[PDB]
Subunit: 258 residues, 4 copies
């Protein structure tokens, strides 16, 4: 309840899923949290539920929404210590020939450029507080995924960008790290599974993709984020895997040497 | 002179630098090579110089230029075996606060979406030939670089996209790999150094960034590309480092524990 | 003071340096800690200083010392929740031709087989508690170091072994992770620098090997260890870098393309 | 037939499997090859079959065997350009509690220290020729494997050692690289499968562990080795994956978030 007391945190896409788990973790650590989301329903309810959290409607693809998010955070709370760039989307499975350049651009706008824009606008305040940036990337940026060429590309970009910004901001004492989750049970995971021919089979396969034999929880990503913000003072430019071991060992990757 | 005989290769940005080195390597391997470049000067001269190479003016950010590149390759040579996505640019050093979202978008168009578009248009022909894709990424997509947030992000995206496409195309026997060069002495390296306060000092530091104590050559990237195309039949989704060991060991990263 | 309350932790090489920092972090988290060290001086003083810590003399290269360490931990505290394999050594800089197979074997005994032996003897108790293993590896296992072939090999082995054991123990709910520190200011760092022609210059170079421009502290490694034990329930088989960004970006690796 | 003409190559464990594939690749490249193996049957037959290959009986765990291997290579052929450290073994699947420290030591002697010893004895001659070292590691050193803690540890050590030695030998122009194969169909793979309850099912699972849907061939590892020796002049300290994409994407790693 005190490991991040007195600090101010902005969490994008904080209204549900991983984002909401991160919001809860920071509130439980003693921080004041600004919940940003493009949808009102979940975030407004979270503000009512959590003392110390407030909701600001903000679409991270709209530069002027983000400018207002930062200026309102400063106006209302007087400082900014941590930005968690969690807002993002995973399209339904798409074969490469079914993707389009314009859809790829749209996904870059959310998953990459929204993170870039908030980080840019926040950095002057993070420099004053020697604060930090946490980007939510994905394991599939590192190892790939089938039927997700645009999505994978956007998360490879986020992870690499994290390292570049870590280098640039290190002289100011501002750390920049990312978390790469694997399969986390969220409303988006459930929505994507519902599109599949056999949603139950898709969910079971998702559980068995981890040696631990289950998917992860938003609270587990949130704990990793609170660690990076509050106790990882010699960590910058790292990719913290929260994946249950999915990247480890041999598995079933195809549907003796010729 | 025969390890890739009878094969047809498209190299983007092939008029100078790494691209020209890759063109020469494939011609020396027995392949017919289509040189794509947005500038005429170097590529036209290379066609005249190299039997088995032809030049097609093509800006990879212009979807209709790329469609014509593919249709002309097929019309003129009857097949397509390998696409080398080398066209790309590195901006001058830019602090994060000096970058813009619109400049970031423009760099994504070249370094990422041009690779995406040519690959998409070529894949039906690569499936017929069980051909392969080689993307030219960068070491800095993996380890970051200072004063290059947009550039680093684009190359992290290329490397990740390579793995995603490798997964999607594996059932068709089409391999997708990337080469991540470190410091290669090219006209772009020389142009970037010329912008610096002490170009000679910048070049010397660039040589000493490798344990081998020199920069690499376009011919060395070209040899790696010919290997991936012609002899790496069990390699897909790999990142082949051509860096002289720059990623190894401790070095000077800042300008005792507090 | 409560995030790991009621838990029992064994820290090898806990008498000074990183090990002592890890001991302090776990005591501050509410755990009871068994300090193992082959030397009495530091560990005995730490027991006197810290309520909740006790010292057991134990050389991790001596299988019967380690058996007694585990049986005494269980006899005295009734459970075992976390083993931190920190005991290890870095020889003075040695050129490859100056190393010997027998010295390499001796270093494997400490840095690798001591970790293996304690982990093996502890695992039946860790299974009962759904506890976890934390191995202290090194960044140089991942990126190499000059004049340290045997040492680097031992830490590459520890990091890989961590992943293998994570796979094997995942069905039992026992997580296995490692921390890879970079330059941490410890008595061993100071001892190694004292051997050099210009110790002050060696220390300054060690500080500048990180973008953050300083070395790390034992307390920072300790915080990472407490995170892995207490709050990283979906992390297994990970390598948590505590390096200040030393692996990022280009640096000086040698003492333009030919 | 000329890309490595005039060069002399030593391949350990060259009598069958990957080693024999590497021997054949180097002979086909124009090199003279010394086949080292502890068993006579396969290697003696290979000498008879291949002009330009000779067989020397040599157990790489016996330091005096290795000294004789190097001195006989020099006596007979006058130079040494490349050492391929391929000799190694994978034990049957073993749960961690079924392993022993003494078995772990024995496996380190072969998989790690044999590579170390030959490399050490060869380096004075490799310096004279600006030759290179190729170590055969494994993908599982990087990602782990179930029921193979000692084996995985030895290959993590080989990969890390490769990078350390690359750093140390870079001032002399001697490159040191490794190849990490995934599932390669060899007599050892077949022997290991024969131990399993359902060998046919084990082999099928091994094929499906790669997105390419087959295992690799010794010839494919051999081609990668010839590339590293003959055409990778700016590559040092790299890990060249020859895995068919096994490390990519999600798969089946266990036998929704709790
Ligand atoms: N769930 C997983 O398994 C998983 C795995 C790896 C990475 N991730 C990443 O974690 C993040 C959250 O994923 P999730 O599963 O919780 O998703 P989710 O869809 O359940 O929640 C995302 C939230 O972000 C909000 N959001 C979307 N677009 C926005 C925009 N333009 N501006 C502001 N808010 C916006 C949504 O309204 C929603 O509240 C994403 O970046 C995703 O790529 C998720
Ligand atoms: N030189 C290095 O050290 C280095 C290191 C890592 C990666 N790379 C990558 O290698 C590639 C080539 O780099 P280089 O140093 O040879 O650069 P370069 O500028 O010397 O050559 C690039 C070529 O691409 C062409 N090109 C640029 N934009 C194009 C477009 N829209 N359409 C078609 N052609 C276009 C240029 O006209 C030029 O001929 C780039 O992708 C770069 O990011 C270079
Ligand atoms: N200091 C760094 O920069 C650094 C960096 C990366 C990794 N590491 C690793 O961190 C660990 C601790 O390093 P440090 O710098 O604190 O070293 P240190 O020498 O200061 O402390 C190590 C402690 O381990 C004890 N120890 C040594 N051999 C032992 C044995 N056989 N049995 C029991 N205890 C034994 C020593 O007596 C000492 O108290 C080591 O594994 C080292 O490889 C250190
Ligand atoms: N087959 C695979 O899928 C695979 C995958 C990854 C790595 N590897 C590695 O590739 C190498 C070769 O594996 P393989 O499958 O061809 O094995 P294999 O058992 O078929 O062949 C290995 C050869 O090495 C020889 N050898 C063994 N011990 C020796 C010693 N002490 N001295 C000299 N020669 C010795 C054997 O007699 C044999 O001829 C090993 O290092 C192995 O770890 C294999
Ligand atoms: O991994 C990611 O980054 C990710 C991000 C957001 C949500 C879920 C994930 C996991 C993979 C996702 O989950 C699916 C379910 C059904 C079909 C396709 C799916 O892909
Ligand atoms: O690494 C890359 O991908 C890359 C790509 C194209 C060209 C050169 C490079 C190397 C780094 C580059 O070279 C510079 C020289 C002067 C200032 C800044 C520089 O950055
Ligand atoms: O990195 C490691 O794992 C490590 C482990 C223990 C202690 C220190 C280190 C850092 C490198 C070490 O510090 C040196 C100082 C002078 C000469 C050589 C040195 O190497
Ligand atoms: O991956 C490696 O390094 C390796 C090395 C040598 C031989 C084979 C391999 C693949 C894994 C191996 O193949 C098995 C088959 C049956 C049971 C267990 C097995 O493990
Ligand atoms: O919708 C799937 C899951 O999403 C998570 O974000 C919620 O915390 C869970 O309550 C829910 O079961
Ligand atoms: O301009 C720098 C270098 O660029 C390379 O692409 C050319 O092959 C070299 O001749 C030239 O020295
Ligand atoms: O000896 C170097 C450093 O070692 C660390 O372990 C101690 O905590 C410090 O007090 C000391 O300055
Ligand atoms: O024994 C399995 C395989 O081993 C390989 O080394 C041989 O080249 C093959 O002929 C054989 O099928
Ligand atoms: Na509230
Ligand atoms: Na021509
Ligand atoms: Na005490
Ligand atoms: Na012969």
């Amino acid at each position: 309840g005190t490991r991040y007391a007195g600090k101010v945190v902005v969490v994008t896409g904080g209204g549900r899923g991983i984002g909401a788990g991160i919001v809860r973790a920071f509130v439980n650590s003693g921080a004041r949290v600004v919940i940003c989301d493009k949808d009102e329903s979940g975030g407004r309810a979270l503000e009512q539920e959590l003392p110390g959290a407030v909701f600001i409607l903000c679409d991270v693809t709209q530069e002027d929404d983000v400018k207002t998010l930062v200026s309102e955070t400063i106006r209302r709370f007087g400082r900014l210590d941590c930005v968690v760039n969690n807002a993002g989307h995973h399209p339904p499975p798409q074969r490469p020939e079914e993707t389009s350049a314009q859809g790829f651009r749209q996904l870059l706008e959310l998953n990459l450029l929204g993170t870039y824009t908030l980080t840019k606008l926040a950095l002057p305040y993070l420099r004053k507080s020697q604060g930090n940036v946490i980007n939510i990337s994905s394991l599939v940026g590192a190892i790939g995924q089938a039927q997700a060429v645009p999505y994978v590309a956007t998360k490879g970009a986020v992870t690499a960008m994290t390292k570049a910004l870590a280098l640039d901001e290190s002289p100011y004492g501002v750390r920049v790290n990312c978390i790469s989750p694997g399969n986390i049970w969220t409303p988006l995971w459930e929505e994507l599974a519902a599109l599949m021919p056999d949603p139950r089979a898709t969910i079971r396969e998702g559980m068995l993709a981890q040696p631990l034999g289950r998917m992860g929880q938003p609270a587990e990503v949130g704990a990793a984020a609170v660690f990076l913000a509050s106790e990882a003072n010699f960590c910058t430019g790292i990719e913290l895997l929260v994946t249950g071991g999915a990247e480890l060992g041999y598995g079933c990757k195809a549907s003796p040497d010729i």
